[PDB]
Amino acid sequence: PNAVEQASEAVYKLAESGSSLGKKVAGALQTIETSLAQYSLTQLCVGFNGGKDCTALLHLFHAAVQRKLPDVPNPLQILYIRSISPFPELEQFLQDTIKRYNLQMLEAEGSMKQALGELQARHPQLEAVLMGTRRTDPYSCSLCPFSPTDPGWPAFMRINPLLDWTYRDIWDFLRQLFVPYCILYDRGYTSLGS
Ligand SMILES: Cc1cc2nc3c(=O)[nH]c(=O)nc-3n(C[C@H](O)[C@H](O)[C@H](O)COP(=O)(O)OP(=O)(O)OC[C@H]3O[C@@H](n4cnc5c(N)ncnc54)[C@H](O)[C@@H]3O)c2cc1C
């Protein structure tokens, strides 16, 4: 077996386990399942930058899709904004992830706002972006699970299933489900945030 093939079973077994982490996973999965009722798989993507937060999120998204929409032929979409020179270990992880989950990647380059705008013009049906955001400052503590982008931003629905997860929660989840993550976290990196 592999983690991707086994996601739907193992992820929902954890969510049904009653552990502290199980309750976090169940909460995330409820947000994602709600997302799947609101948005088609052409309308929905995961904001993916190779970090541990969106790695956990992608695994949750795949697991929910396998459970609620196994016959839908559409592939899972990720959105990646390239805002910095290539970092070889991170690029390899992105390519590896694309292969593992058979992803359709929507990519643009430049600043977040300009690149999101370009991506919107190229993919006008895209409505919603699953985000790995956690509650780490006053702004993120103010977010709802479904939070439209702020004024002055390309208009998307941000969906935030991990708001209540801790740093420890993210690592416990990835380790307990044997989910591959970017090798940079083994080489002294604590965050890949901007
Ligand atoms: C689609 C989208 C809409 C946004 N809308 C707003 C907004 O309305 N108001 C505002 O103040 N900020 C907005 N942001 C900015 C966002 O909140 C972060 O400040 C920014 O993405 C940098 O994230 P970080 O990795 O530094 O940290 P974090 O805030 O921890 O990142 C949160 C999540 O953003 C996603 N993400 C981050 N970097 C990328 C990337 N390069 N490509 C794709 N997804 C990425 C991932 O899902 C990540 O888990 C938006 C970002 C995205 C991608």
Side-chain angles (χ1 to χ4, degrees), residues 47-77:
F48 197 83
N49 68 350
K52 68 185 185 275
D53 292 346
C54 61
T55 300
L57 174 61
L58 176 57
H59 198 67
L60 293 166
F61 179 46
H62 167 77
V65 169
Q66 277 318 98
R67 178 138 298 208
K68 302 278 288 173
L69 310 163
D71 319 302
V72 177
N74 289 82
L76 308 179
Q77 298 186 118

Side-chain angles (χ1 to χ4, degrees), residues 47-49 79 81 116 131-133 139 149-150 153 158 193-194:
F48 197 83
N49 68 350
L79 184 152
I81 304 194
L116 274 169
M131 312 268 292
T133 306
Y139 175 85
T149 52
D150 291 316
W153 283 75
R158 299 171 291 179
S194 175

